[PDB]
Structure 1
Amino acid sequence: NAKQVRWCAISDLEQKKCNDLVGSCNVPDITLVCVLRSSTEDCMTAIKDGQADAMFLDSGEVYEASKDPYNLKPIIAEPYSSNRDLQKCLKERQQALAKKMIGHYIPQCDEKGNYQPQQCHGSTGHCWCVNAMGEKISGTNTPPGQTRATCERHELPKCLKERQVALGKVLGRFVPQCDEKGNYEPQQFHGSTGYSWCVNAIGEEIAGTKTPPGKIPATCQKHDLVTTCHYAVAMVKKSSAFQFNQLKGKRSCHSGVSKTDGWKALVTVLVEKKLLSWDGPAKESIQRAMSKFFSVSCIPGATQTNLCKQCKGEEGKNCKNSHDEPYYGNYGAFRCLKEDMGDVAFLRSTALSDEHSEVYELLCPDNTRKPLNKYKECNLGTVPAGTVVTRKISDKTEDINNFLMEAQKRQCKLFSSAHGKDLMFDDSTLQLALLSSEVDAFLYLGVKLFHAMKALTGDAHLPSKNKVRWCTINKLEKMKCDDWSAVSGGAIACTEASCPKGCVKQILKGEADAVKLEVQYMYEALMCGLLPAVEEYHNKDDFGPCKTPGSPYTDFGTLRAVALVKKSNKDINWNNIKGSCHTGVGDIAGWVIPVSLIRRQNDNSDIDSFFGCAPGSDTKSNLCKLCKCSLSDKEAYYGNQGAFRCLVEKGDFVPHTVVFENTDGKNPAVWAKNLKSEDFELLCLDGSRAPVSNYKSCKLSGIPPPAIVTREESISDVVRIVANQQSLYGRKGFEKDMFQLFSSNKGNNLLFNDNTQCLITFDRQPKDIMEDYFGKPYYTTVYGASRSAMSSELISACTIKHCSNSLEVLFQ
């Protein structure tokens, strides 16, 4: 029935606005309640205690909020416009139609879902022109009763036109590789010359990343072009004459001690410019070093008296993280500078307006001054948007989201008030969208910014070059790793995660050093800059590579994905497979490799309508009938052998080893006992029906081996410690009676697969690391040889956001 959402207010003005929303905003079955506290930190505590449910935090406060004594988590935030947004016109049309208002602009889309080149605001009669991303072409807005601008289609991305400008007069210049939708691949390979280099979002080469053919190519990050960026700036009056390197001793006003635009961006610049004498957060609090840097200041929330001297709040509210302090916030910091209580104001660029351009200007970190409109060139760094937070337990996230989504639909005045600016939310907020429940402080801030916040609060870990922290995914692995650590002589330590993805995050966060990953997780890990140090070797026939490291191997023990049929017992070939059964929807050989080939050779729909048992593929489906159909042992057609039972029972895609298993009498069953290796064989493309013994040639694809990944700067140490530990323990080790790497009484396949022969150091080749790990057939088949084949919250956190006024640049 009726639920309630308790919003926390840090000030009297915020409670006045919040109570206005309680009266004027009617959301059915949700009741808004306003809880009052005296500061930002007291509101975070109230949410932690269950006294309130939601509040809005600056991005600079997200990291500290995620820890004791707050333990808060971002749930709702304003989305930015990226150059990777799909079906944007359709989504934007739905949102506008969802608004409970009449006469608002509703974007117009064609049949394909693209923007119509001309967009009109029906209620006002104004029309304008737009590119493929919906951005208004400058100057094309016309009122009713006036000749309209004629609108061209701007649908050709920047790269795709460069392909056919270089494809041309039989020249020899280079052609770029770009993923679908025309975006530049971050890694570029020159066809004529073995050179490799890397580009940003708009395809221009970054810098020192070009490499000759014989050398290892650079490790290069995915870039995204994002619009509307806000910046941290230092604002000063034109009357003053000092520059940035003369800030010491001056009077300053800051939006807040915990805010990026008021403190954290400034401290980063002061340290990099060597203007701030600071030993470090372990030796000295950053506030103490800053207290000696400035003479007197107003920095709301500060615990040094001189940093609170210039504040204007009445006693009990002076220097508080609250609008009760008149100088709090971006506009509060501007007010102090206006009233000559400080010589410089540190605030967000959103508080800049052309009205201030007469008296005010910007203080640039290169010791120059520039006008306000040059803030994109005169700033202390980008500031990501704030976010709504709640408890990590996330008990009331659903109720909080339903309220804000409904309040936005009903045009409630969330982002403005007569009482003041930036109350409850940033006034610049256009909309708030729900975040994935996977998102936390690390994923929201991103890998680079997270470490900057971690280092700034003195939680930065420095890994020991002589110890490897190994991440586990369950209690049994933790027990075996503890057994390993106790016999490692300080070389091995153990961390705990719930899944391999969590282990990858811990390595990126600096909380762990190494983990073994199956093939499914390698795409994200390699995308985030991790690298394989050692890999599981499974060739039980050859021991040369294990006994002596560096000696070559003939077969790494890889599985090969193949399609097994009987020899003309059935007359099937690859080209008439329409009208087979698979191990499982998630398995690589059973599903990933075949389905990737199918969709690649004729762009269509595999989900159904291509075949005439594939567990985990819904029910009442084309294949789920042949099996019920659960991705579980309880289905008798699940797994490697389960897919073998399907080939014999109404047979029409498995690893190569499965046929040799059960055959020749190996599996005691009523069905698969009296069949032999001459009865079955495999489908190759265009070749077909090799005697199942010609795999490695009659294969759909090879499957790369499991890899142990780590950071690039930890590669040499991890392999060194693993190699030393492998000589002691594991198969044929000096102290193998003390402990075993590839077997355990705690369980099976802990940390590594128990059938692993040994770990072999990864031989890196002068090739793309995605190709270098996966191999060209697997990389091309499964992921299209592209860095954009899959997207996720983890990959987004590992993606560099590159600011641009508009996406327009990608179209001309």
Structure 2
Amino acid sequence: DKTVRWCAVSEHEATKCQSFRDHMKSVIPSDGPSVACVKKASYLDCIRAIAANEADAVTLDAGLVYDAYLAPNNLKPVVAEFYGSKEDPQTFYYAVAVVKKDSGFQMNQLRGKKSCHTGLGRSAGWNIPIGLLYCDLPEPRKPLEKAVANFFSGSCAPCADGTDFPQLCQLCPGCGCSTLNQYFGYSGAFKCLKDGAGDVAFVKHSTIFENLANKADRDQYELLCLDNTRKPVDEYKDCHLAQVPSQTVVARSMGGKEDLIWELLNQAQEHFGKDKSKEFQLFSSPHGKDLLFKDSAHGFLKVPPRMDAKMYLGYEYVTAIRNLREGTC
């Protein structure tokens, strides 16, 4: 069924990708789908490679899915991750603002604080929180990256340009756009908070649970609610910034191999999905968290025929992004 060229960002994902192909080949017949690995330094290089027919697939946060749909790449979502459980799949997750207990500040008091973001342009780590704080930012609010840098007193916004927006990398010099940057992604943003570099981490509802197994340790953290109060990390359903579409695998519109990508991932989730194998796991890895796919995912769902990013993401989230990039006060 031909080979799907998967795009791995940096060495940790490259390692997991190699294991993915090795294990798939050990259980799949010469008739079944196979995986090949193409390593890039950033998800941006992956989008380029896919559009240039140098790679076939890569999983992207919904905010990035939107970006990849823009010309001249025009990539489309083909397979979505789903969370929660297989019995009740969730094609969305909650964006939350995690902070340390007794730090003494609410959402409307974030000015002058230090921020840890999953990455520039990502849903929970950027689009949602910055979209909500837009008008609190000092003018001129454009370019947004600089206004955010001026609002906080130091941040870590992976993938941001450290030359033009130096303070956005104050918490993670260089703003590396891969796991090479220890403060990249959900768990990286959380570590940025835990280590004490930042005062707040913009991540998802499962992030703290993925990093602190004991409740006693989680009790030292809280969430900032939109009504300017704080609640326990377990109460995210009643204290989140917003809900966002799940991260999805994108591919080319023409000769994109979406049928094979699904065939590969569908069989893969049966062989190496949650609790399926003692040899390999699609949703976890001894090499790191959220490599290739999010650890919080429980499986995959095929995206409807020919659906583009805008339609897939939904009018609400698309509007959120457009209002962030446009909008006034």
Fold conserved between structures, TM > 0.5: yes
Stretches of structure 1 lacking an aligned partner (at least 5 in a row) = 82-91, 93-133, 136-225, 313-317, 461-812
Q: Pick from 294, 313, 332: which aligns with 2:152? A: 294
Deviation at 1:395, TM superposition (A): 2.9
Contact 2:190 2:208 in 1 (8 A): no
Q: Pick from 323, 343, 362: which aligns with 2:199? A: 343
Partner of 2:222: 361
Give per-residue Cα distances to partners, 1:619-641, cap 9 Å, x unaligned.
Answer: xxxxxxxxxxxxxxxxxxxxxxx
Contact 2:82 2:92 in 1 (8 A): no
Letter in 2 for 1:442: K
TM-score of the aligned structures, taking structure 2 as reference length:
0.87
Give the whole-Å Cα distance in 1 for the aligned partners of 2:39 and 2:230.
41
Pair 227,40 (structure 1): closer, same or farther in 2 beyond 3 Å = closer
Letter in 1 for 2:147: A
Partner of 1:19: 18
Deviation at 1:409, TM superposition (A): 2.4
Partner of 1:220: none
Stretches of structure 2 lacking an aligned partner (at least 5 in a row) = 210-214, 273-279
Letter in 1 for 2:95: A
Determine if the alignment matches structure 1 residue 322 to structure 2 residue 178. yes
Deviation at 1:44, TM superposition (A): 1.0
Deviation at 1:338, TM superposition (A): 0.8
Letter in 1 for 2:200: V
Contact 2:128 2:320 in 1 (8 A): no
Letter in 2 for 1:57: L
Partner of 2:95: 232
Letter in 2 for 1:21: F
1:316-465 counterparts in 2 under 5 A? Answer: 318-353=174-209, 354=215, 356-411=217-272, 413-458=281-326
SS of aligned partner of 1:63? helix
Give the whole-Å Cα distance in 1 for the aligned partners of 2:314 and 2:232.
31
Which stretches of structure 1, 4 residues or longer, exceed 4 Å deviation after superposition? Answer: 226-229
1:125-524 counterparts in 2 under 5 A? Answer: 230-271=93-134, 274-278=135-139, 284-303=142-161, 304-311=165-172, 318-353=174-209, 354=215, 356-411=217-272, 413-458=281-326
Give the whole-Å Cα distance in 1 for the aligned partners of 2:226 and 2:266.
40
SS of aligned partner of 2:79? strand
Partner of 2:3: 4
Contact 1:63 1:454 in 2 (8 A): no
Determine if the alignment matches structure 1 residue 51 to structure 2 residue 50. no
Deviation at 1:394, TM superposition (A): 4.5
Pair 278,25 (structure 1): closer, same or farther in 2 beyond 3 Å = farther
Contact 1:232 1:349 in 2 (8 A): yes
Pair 367,407 (structure 1): closer, same or farther in 2 beyond 3 Å = same
Q: Root-mean-square deviation (CA), in Å?
A: 2.2
Give the whole-Å Cα distance in 2 for the aligned partners of 1:388 and 1:228.
13
**Whose Rg is larger?**
1
SS of aligned partner of 2:172? coil
Pair 238,397 (structure 1): closer, same or farther in 2 beyond 3 Å = same
Letter in 2 for 1:336: C
Partner of 1:65: 68
Pair 76,373 (structure 1): closer, same or farther in 2 beyond 3 Å = same
Give the whole-Å Cα distance in 2 for the aligned partners of 1:332 and 1:446.
28
Pair 372,80 (structure 1): closer, same or farther in 2 beyond 3 Å = closer
SS of aligned partner of 1:346? strand
SS of aligned partner of 1:410? helix
Give the whole-Å Cα distance in 2 for the aligned partners of 1:228 and 1:352.
20
Give the whole-Å Cα distance in 2 for the aligned partners of 1:434 and 1:227.
14
Give the whole-Å Cα distance in 2 for the aligned partners of 1:69 and 1:320.
24
Give the whole-Å Cα distance in 2 for the aligned partners of 1:8 and 1:355.
39
Contact 2:83 2:296 in 1 (8 A): no
Deviation at 1:260, TM superposition (A): 0.8
Contact 1:252 1:343 in 2 (8 A): yes
SS of aligned partner of 1:409? helix
Deviation at 1:229, TM superposition (A): 5.1
Contact 1:297 1:309 in 2 (8 A): yes
Give per-residue Cα distances to partners, 1:87-146, cap 9 Å, x unaligned.
Answer: xxxxx9xxxxxxxxxxxxxxxxxxxxxxxxxxxxxxxxxxxxxxxxx78xxxxxxxxxxx
Give the whole-Å Cα distance in 1 for the aligned partners of 2:224 and 2:319.
27
Partner of 1:555: none
Partner of 1:616: none
Deviation at 1:454, TM superposition (A): 2.8
Give the whole-Å Cα distance in 2 for the aligned partners of 1:238 and 1:228.
30
Deviation at 1:320, TM superposition (A): 2.0
Partner of 2:275: none
Partner of 1:187: none
Give the whole-Å Cα distance in 2 for the aligned partners of 1:229 and 1:448.
13
SS of aligned partner of 1:14? helix
Contact 2:269 2:299 in 1 (8 A): yes
Pair 36,80 (structure 1): closer, same or farther in 2 beyond 3 Å = closer
Deviation at 1:31, TM superposition (A): 2.5
TM-score of the aligned structures, taking structure 1 as reference length:
0.36
SS of aligned partner of 2:254? coil
Structure with greater helix percent: 2
Give per-residue Cα distances to partners, 1:720-742, cap 9 Å, x unaligned.
Answer: xxxxxxxxxxxxxxxxxxxxxxx
Deviation at 1:367, TM superposition (A): 1.9
Give per-residue Cα distances to partners, 1:355-408, cap 9 Å, x unaligned.
Answer: 542221112222211111111111111122111001122531122111111212
Give the whole-Å Cα distance in 1 for the aligned partners of 2:316 and 2:206.
24
Partner of 1:98: none
Partner of 2:43: 40
SS of aligned partner of 1:19? helix
The one of the two structures with greater contact order (alpha-carbon pairs below 8 A, sep at least 6) is 2
Contact 1:74 1:387 in 2 (8 A): yes
Contact 1:45 1:69 in 2 (8 A): no
Contact 2:83 2:297 in 1 (8 A): no
Contact 1:278 1:286 in 2 (8 A): no
1:530-549 counterparts in 2 under 5 A? Answer: none
Contact 1:6 1:53 in 2 (8 A): yes
Identity %: 43
Contact 1:38 1:320 in 2 (8 A): no
Partner of 1:731: none
Give the whole-Å Cα distance in 2 for the aligned partners of 1:266 and 1:293.
13
Give the whole-Å Cα distance in 2 for the aligned partners of 1:252 and 1:79.
28
Deviation at 1:80, TM superposition (A): 7.3
Contact 2:80 2:91 in 1 (8 A): no
Deviation at 1:242, TM superposition (A): 1.8
